[PDB]
Amino acid sequence: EDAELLVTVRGGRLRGIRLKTPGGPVSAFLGIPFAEPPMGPRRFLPPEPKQPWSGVVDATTFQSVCYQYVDTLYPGFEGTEMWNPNRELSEDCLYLNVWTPYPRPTSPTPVLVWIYGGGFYSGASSLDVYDGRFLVQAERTVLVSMNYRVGAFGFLALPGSREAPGNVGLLDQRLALQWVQENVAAFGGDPTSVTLFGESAGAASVGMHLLSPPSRGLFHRAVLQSGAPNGPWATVGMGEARRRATQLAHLVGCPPNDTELVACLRTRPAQVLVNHEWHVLPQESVFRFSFVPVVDGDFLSDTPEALINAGDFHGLQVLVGVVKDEGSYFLVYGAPGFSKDNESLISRAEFLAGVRVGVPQVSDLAAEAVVLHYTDWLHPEDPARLREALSDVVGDHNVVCPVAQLAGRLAAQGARVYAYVFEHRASTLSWPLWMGVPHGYEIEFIFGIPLDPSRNYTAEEKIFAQRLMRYWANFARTGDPNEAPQWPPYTAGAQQYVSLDLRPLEVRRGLRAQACAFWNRFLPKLLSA
Amino acid sequence: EDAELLVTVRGGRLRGIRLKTPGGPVSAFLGIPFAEPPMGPRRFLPPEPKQPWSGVVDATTFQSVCYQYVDTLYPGFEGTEMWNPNRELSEDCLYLNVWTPYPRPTSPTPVLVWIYGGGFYSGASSLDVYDGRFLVQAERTVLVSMNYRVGAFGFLALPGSREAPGNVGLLDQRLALQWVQENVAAFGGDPTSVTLFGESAGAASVGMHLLSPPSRGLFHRAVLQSGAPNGPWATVGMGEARRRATQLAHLVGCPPGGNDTELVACLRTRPAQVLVNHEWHVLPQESVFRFSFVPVVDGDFLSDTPEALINAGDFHGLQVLVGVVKDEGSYFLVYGAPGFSKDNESLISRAEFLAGVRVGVPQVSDLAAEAVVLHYTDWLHPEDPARLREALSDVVGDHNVVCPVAQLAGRLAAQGARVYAYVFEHRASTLSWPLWMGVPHGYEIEFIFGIPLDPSRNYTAEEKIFAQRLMRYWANFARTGDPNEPAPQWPPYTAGAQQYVSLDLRPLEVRRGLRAQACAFWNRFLPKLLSA
Ligand SMILES: *[C@@H]1O[C@H](CO[C@@H]2O[C@@H](C)[C@@H](O)[C@@H](O)[C@@H]2O)[C@@H](O[C@@H]2O[C@H](CO)[C@@H](O)[C@H](O)[C@H]2NC(C)=O)[C@H](O)[C@H]1NC(C)=O
Ligand SMILES: NC(=O)c1cc[n+](COC[n+]2ccccc2/C=N/O)cc1
Ligand SMILES: NC(=O)c1cc[n+](COC[n+]2ccccc2/C=N/O)cc1
Ligand SMILES: *[C@@H]1O[C@H](CO)[C@@H](O)[C@H](O)[C@H]1NC(C)=O
Ligand SMILES: *[C@@H]1O[C@H](CO)[C@@H](O)[C@H](O)[C@H]1NC(C)=O
User: How close is the Cα of B121 to the center of ligand 1, in Å?
Assistant: First the structure.
């Protein structure tokens, strides 16, 4: 009966749902099919556009979560289950979601497209912390998010083969972006103003769409939160991709011919691949994931590092940033002596052991270089500083310094870059205090979750959330987050960024400039000579 | 005749002189021969002990400076002329000096033995800054200093050969130490309480005597000022020692390699100055803080490298006093680093800094130089001229002095020796070097020898108090192995706490770590890099 909730897209008709916010209603269209279900013979294959349907597709609830591992480290703990699937798992998972103002915009409205993270092995557009109703209400944007295949289903690759070409999870994302170009106007969105934003592997995904020409024509601005395509975890070579796919087949009961092997893997229930996918990693590590985008000359014609250094980025505006303590979250999943249920006051021996799990597949000389830069040789063995130091090792090597490299190259090659460090610890944060501001805990403020009255955020946290939503939407609208004091662009020389917390904007210089000189300037030379 | 200035040593009778000092008289025996003159057939050979003499030998003035290069970069400039020869140059130079109180002490008195520095190519015991009269009058010590051969004459080596075995300049020092054991009691000195102290190459020499068993038995305490035997400039391997000796002989026409005795015999016929004029052409690169002829690790005087010996040594029963000046590196930058001069501010560019790293850290791989650039670059101010200037000074000083000294002090502390460490931080009011150089290499010496008490100088009243405090520290260490007053306390240096004291006009301040973060790079990481 509500025509505001009826939409006709290119494939057929949809019925949405009215959602309530403390500031009024918005229109949501959830579980829109954008691809043919990648099942049976379609497993590992690139996505196919959803064939047209008759009747009205019910778009009132989130659809299934793409098949993935479920974290079991702290069962029932808020800090971990908030990232676990909150819908049924299925390979029938290529659906996207649209939120618009209510009533629907009658003038073209800028579009934000969210790509979730989760190390390319997990994630879902349906998690509570990605709820788009508050952003859409407060800043009057059209917000789209899609599910994409993760783990082996999205990124297992036997390069050169047709049965498992790899990067199909990235092609899922691109297909959704194509869907947005063709259909977002039916919801009031403006296809000529599309801003990608993502976090962790989602930020790495955004960066890879920047570096892939078939994707570059489908959006106009980019936001990379706590992730970059040049991360040591975000891509894998062809030879290593083939090794992991081949080992997974072996652990699963399949041969050894690429054709016959993928055929046998197609016979296995999805849960069987999930349970063995972590046993193909070459060693004990943290912040490493089995099946990630592969550099094979197709989706990425070269390594992300090479494409970054060679790129002309005039006309590009980008928003990048990190949280205060990028590494702490990962240390509880493998670094000896760490746990959320203690102070994690590790010994020096545990620190040296943790450096090898935190910087895996490097020579001992490279590891010794790491322990040299991150040791205070006036307090070689103080547990508190050792714990803080290993957090810096994992955080700088995996997030901060890859992001700093990307920002510097883009700025020096024509792009307008804005950088931030998110330094507010949520009053509701369930992780212990020694983790500070962990990986991923700026998301809830950017989506305005503090506005939800059924949660215990403070009044200043609600104000803080509204300011962050204004920054992000300002950037989506104009390529500039400013409306104070002012947020200056990041440059390769001045290296200016702002701290995001409850205090007014504070401008600082250098994203861990000393530490990132080690990772980005020296250690590459050490590894190749 | 005065009975006070007549002494009989094992070789014959000596006549000395009574020196005036502001505090009072001291007895000086200057220019006592302890070796047969190492000239003619005795060039490059180990020193032979002085054969006994009849009559009285007048030890009344300093003897010749051992033949050596004369510095020419700033002619007439006081800051450089103070290190140049102040006596005639000669190969007949193996003489030592003994200062003793007046009247001579009734009971055996501890003995300080000075070994001058100068990169093993220069120096002399006659320099004004090594005048022992003020120390001996202030603290009633016996002070001995000796000349030793430098340059090719002291350290040219064709290892395995007998005509030029190498390290003969160290054996001159050893023979002087043997002379002290046999004769210092005749001047009132105690041969069971002998403290070696030296600066720069002299400090490196002191360290090598610690590491050489035939020398270790001739002294009991050591003081190493701004130098260490494990410094990258203080030794060479046998093969590079021979390469340089052969290259030197080739450039002066010898022979017209080959047999070693024939080549050395040809070298013995060359005028001493012609060897000096060519000894710098054998250096393998453009560098600073590298010297052509230095001690050689040949398995004799040094059974292994100083590092290996320091690590494998048991140092119980030994007390050591080590230290550095505040700006160890600046003095060397004006002798070859691009963009540096004493006459301007030396505010170098980024390119000059990178070029300076290669001359301050020579013979390292390109990757090794990259590691140096990474550690000493401030990546928030990568091109600030003043920062680059101080950074290159840090590079040269850390690599050559501070970190070698810190590696030595830490190992000996952890292996049974009682160590005391200092950083000398006072800039003399009379210093002639420009202000950007800070407290340069070697400018604590004049305060340790009490030169500010000289009537003819112009030090402030404070600097004379400061000199008297430092002389007391050194003599307290010589007497008891402990610089502290038997007043702010000076704690041992240990591998863990790494405590040292600052020496300036202020009272003693305790600090931790001798450039700990920097020296971790030089002493722990970079060796691993050069291996792989
Ligand atoms: C600072 O001076 C150095 C050295 O130049 C010397 O000192 C000058 C004051 C003047 O007396 C010169 O005659 C001296 O040679 C400069 O570096 C030299 O610059 C000259 C001229 O460009 C060049 O030919 C030499 O090769 C340079 N030598 C070195 C060691 O770099 C330096 O450029 C001056 N920097 C300033 C002006 O701040
Ligand atoms: N499919 C699996 O068996 C599996 C096992 C472990 N993990 C990783 O879960 C731990 N974890 C959870 C959250 C964030 C990071 C990490 C680990 N990083 O190295 C994924 C899949
Ligand atoms: N025999 C020579 O020609 C000669 C030339 C130069 N030097 C060294 O003089 C320069 N210098 C003088 C004082 C202190 C350091 C330095 C340089 N060190 O690399 C010695 C001998
Ligand atoms: C915090 O919020 C939770 C639900 O999110 C609620 O159960 C709890 O009572 C709240 N605590 C307060 C308001 O102190
Ligand atoms: C070198 O020459 C001398 C003199 O001719 C000769 O006695 C000796 O055997 C030769 N070999 C050596 C030892 O260098």
Answer: 27
Question: Nearest 10 degrees: CA dihedral of A58, A61, A65, A70?
Answer: -160
B337 lines ligand 3 (CB under 6 A): no
Which residue from B518, B364, B30 is spatially nearest to A378, judged by alpha carbons?
A: B518
Atom number of ligand 4 nearest to Cα A455:
5
Query: B374 and A518: CB-CB below 8 Å?
Result: yes
Phi and psi for B505 in degrees, rounded to 5?
-70, -25
- The phi and psi torsions of B109 (rounded to 5 degrees) equal -115, 140
**A333: Cβ below 6 Å to ligand 2?**
yes
Distance of CA B306 to the CA centre of its chain: 16
Q: Which residues pair with A509 in a beta bridge?
A: A496
* Structure tokens that stand for A215 in this block: 């994707």
Note whether A173 and A61 are within 8 A (CB): no
- CATH number for the domain including B518? 3.40.50.1820
* Helix A201-210 / helix A168-183 crossing angle, nearest 10 deg: 70
- A512 to chain B, closest Cα gap in Å: 9
- For residue A225, give the DSSP letter: E
Distance of CA A270 to the CA centre of its chain: 23
Nearest listed ligand to the Cα of residue B389: 1
Q: Write the DSSP assignment of A1-20 as a string of letters.
A: --GGGEEEETTEEEE-EEE-
**What method did the depositors use to determine the structure?**
X-ray
d(CA A448, CA A131): 9
Q: Give the pairing type, strands A89-90 and A95-101.
A: unpaired
Cα separation, A25 vs A446, in Å, equals: 19
Ligand in closest contact with the CA of A117 = 2
- Ligand 2 pocket residue status of A153, Cβ below 6 Å: no
Scored b (16 or more CB within 10 A) or e, A197-222 reads bbbbbbbbbbbbbbbbeebeebbbbb
Q: What is the DSSP letter of B451?
A: G
A91 is catalytic: no
Phi-psi region of A297 (alpha: psi -120 to 50; beta: other; left: phi over 0): left
Residue B68: which of B115, B31, B123, B136 has the closest Cα?
A: B123
Q: Distance from the CA of B174 to the center of ligand 5, in angstroms? A: 30
Split into its structural domains, chain B has a count of 1
- Chain B, nearest residue to A524 by Cα: B367
Q: What's the half-sphere exposure (Cβ side, CA atoms, 13 Å) at A319?
A: 29
For residue B42, what are the domain limits? Answer: 1-532
CB A222 within 8 A of CB A210: yes
SS3 A357: helix
3-state secondary structure A312-334: CCCCCEEEEEEECCCCHHHHCCC
CA-nearest residue to A509 within chain B is B380
Q: Is the CB of B420 under 6 A from ligand 3?
A: no
- How many beta carbons lie within 10 A of that of residue B192, not counting itself? 11
Query: Which residue from B minimizes the CA distance to A363?
Result: B532
CA distances for B211 relative to B115, B222, B230, B307, B523, angstroms: 16, 12, 11, 10, 19
Q: Do the bridges between strand A95-101 and strand A56-58 make them parallel or antiparallel, or are there none, so unpaired? A: unpaired
| CB neighbourhood size of B503 (10 A) | 24
Ligand 4 atom closest to A454 (CA): 5
Q: Is B40 helix (H, G, I), strand (E, B) or coil?
A: helix
Query: CA nearest A511: which of B104, B379, B39?
Result: B379
| Distance from C-alpha of B137 to C-alpha of B120, rounded to nearest angstrom | 30
Q: Do A372 and B498 touch (CB under 8 A)?
A: no
Residues of A near B (CB-CB distance < 8 A)? 363, 365, 368-369, 372, 375-378, 495, 509-510, 513-514, 516-518, 521-522, 525-526, 529
Catalytic residues of B: 200, 328, 441
Contact A496, A509 (CB under 8 A): yes
Sequence letter at residue B227: G
* Angstrom distance (rounded) from CA B89 to CA A78: 85
